Ligand binder design. Structure first.
Ligand SMILES: C[S@@+](CC[C@H](N)C(=O)[O-])C[C@H]1O[C@@H](n2cnc3c(N)ncnc32)[C@H](O)[C@@H]1O
Length: 207
């Protein structure tokens, strides 16, 4: 009964109003947002490793929310909050501009079929919305195990003034410590790891 037990402590309800991060987290500290955290393994690991920072997760799949809460409770985390609501609405309504150190989007629904391509969350307007919530120097880190989606993500992100690709080859980045290795990955495999990480830093507009 993880939801029932831990939602009152770590859950954050949808609101028409902006979040006050100091009020929510009881301190002034960097805030990282993970969108679509699934069962929250990455988010819990990240919060556990960074007690000095604060973490917000959003996930519409409520069993994933419950799994994340159960794990967060088991790990004794005080620096994690979760939401169960459309992330785009949360960004629009509740996340203040220029407030986030990092936004993570790991394995967003890849929508393999061409007819479903518009359902993919990484599109220009979404990426711009995320950018507006990053502090300058903040980073949007996404990952996918589907190359067509990786290429699409790269095209979207490369087209937006104010995002600087942190890839030294102008495409993809090495997996950072802040994303755990997954089962979709053969690290060091001759044909590639099987997961594409993209990281872009928010920089001042060039135009
Ligand atoms: C393929 S799963 C990956 C989950 C997790 N990051 C992982 O790697 O295991 C994609 C997740 O994104 C969530 N998701 C899709 N759209 C969302 C949205 N608009 N707001 C919040 N979560 C969303 C889904 O519910 C799903 O759990």
């Amino acid at each position: 009964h993880a939801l029932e037990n831990y939602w009152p402590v770590m859950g954050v309800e949808f609101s028409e109003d902006m979040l006050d991060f100091p009020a929510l987290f009881g301190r002034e500290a960097p805030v990282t947002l993970e969108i679509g955290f699934g069962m929250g393994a990455s988010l819990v690991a990240m919060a556990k490793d960074r007690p000095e920072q604060d973490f917000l997760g959003i996930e519409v799949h409520s069993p994933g929310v419950g799994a994340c809460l159960a794990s967060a409770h088991e790990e004794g985390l005080s620096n994690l909050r979760v939401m169960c609501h459309d992330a785009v609405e949360v960004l629009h309504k509740m996340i203040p501009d220029n407030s986030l150190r990092m936004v993570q989007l790991f394995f967003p629904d890849p929508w393999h079929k061409a007819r479903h391509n518009k359902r993919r969350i990484v599109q220009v307007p979404f990426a711009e919305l995320v950018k507006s919530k990053l502090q300058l120097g903040g980073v949007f880190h996404m990952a996918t195990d589907w190359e067509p989606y990786a290429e699409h993500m790269l095209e979207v992100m490369s087209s937006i003034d104010g995002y600087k690709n942190l890839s030294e080859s102008n495409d993809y980045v090495p997996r950072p410590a802040s994303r755990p290795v997954t089962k979709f990955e053969q690290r060091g495999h001759r044909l590639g790891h099987g997961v594409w990480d993209l990281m872009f830093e928010r920089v001042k507009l060039e135009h």
